Design a protein around this ligand. Sequence first.
Ligand SMILES: [Zn+2]
Lengths: 82, 266
Amino acid sequence: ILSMESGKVLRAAIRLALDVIKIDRLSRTPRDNMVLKLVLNFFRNVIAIEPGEFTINTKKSMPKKGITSIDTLPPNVSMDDI
Amino acid sequence: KGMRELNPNDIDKLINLKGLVLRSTPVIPDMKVAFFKCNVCDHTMAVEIDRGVIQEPARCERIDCNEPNSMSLIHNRCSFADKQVIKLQETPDFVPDGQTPHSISLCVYDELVDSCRAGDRIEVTGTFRSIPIRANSRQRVLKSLYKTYVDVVHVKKVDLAKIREVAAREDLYSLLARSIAPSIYELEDVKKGILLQLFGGTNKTFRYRGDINILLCGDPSTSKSQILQYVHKITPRGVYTSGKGSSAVGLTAYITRLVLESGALV
DNA sequence: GGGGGGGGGGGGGGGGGGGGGTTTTTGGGGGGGGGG
DNA sequence: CCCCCCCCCCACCCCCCCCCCCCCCCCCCCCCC
Ligand SMILES: [Zn+2]
């Protein structure tokens, strides 16, 4: 989402929002209000994604060496991308 | 004291030895400080090696992490001293006539590495040491008699005014020529030729070089052998040999076991 | 309001099971030396 | 000088270890003084 065409999808999202901001505070229906809120949820989500935590099972005791690494990123991602 | 005379009373004393270097290992990295990193939190701590043993931290140092068994050794961030092992043979001056020479392995460290090379006759001052050795690497079980080595702390082997003053002399050519072998009766143009051979010409980049080459023939039972011996004694880095065979020293470069050996010419 | 007791979790120790632990002859190629 | 020979070099118990289970110890919570 951030990288593709410098993130032109973000400009698509603001255009979808501008297409209710154009019609007045009086004009905007509950569906229009929802669409604007949905665009905000898109921006919030895109900010909010962050790598997960390595959630170990604790039924069985630890071996003579602990966890090898906490890194959870998939192989096509680097933390600089995020 | 003799290498053959050492006995278990010496096992921690500072001793002195004399002998012949056979060979040395390449430099062996010896760990002085282990470097540990936490797998979970990437915190790092340095641990000094004590009596050769890694004092591994069982839990991560940081109380805000304190995970067990999570520290791992980062080999190429540890700090290493230099160790080298050298094999020293008992000098034939000391051997009894009817048996092989002994030898002792000696350990040498840091800037004392490569203090000597193969063929060097040396002294060493060092602590006589001994350590156990294992029956098999997968077990702690040790053999009941220790390897011995000496852990060395010292090693040792085995002007212009006059130059310009003598250079002013007029008789210098004859003076220097007679001086190369004054024990030998007059063969003075040979002596002059060999002196000029000792000086030699010059090199150039472009090959043409400064070597001068001489031969003596005529009857066998005459001074030519002594003349070769005297120039051999005079020259800084020359050799003495004869035209064929090899008493463990031969003329040509030669491939043997696989290694290339350089001959007397080279 | 603090101290004791009860209950639950977590760690350590002990036991049990399992797996690992060189010269001598023959043939070939290449190099060196000797005899016609 | 050429060819042939011949010489050389080479190919079952015991220890370490790991897993599993049980008990004990330490902390936290609740009640009693
Ligand atoms: Zn840590």
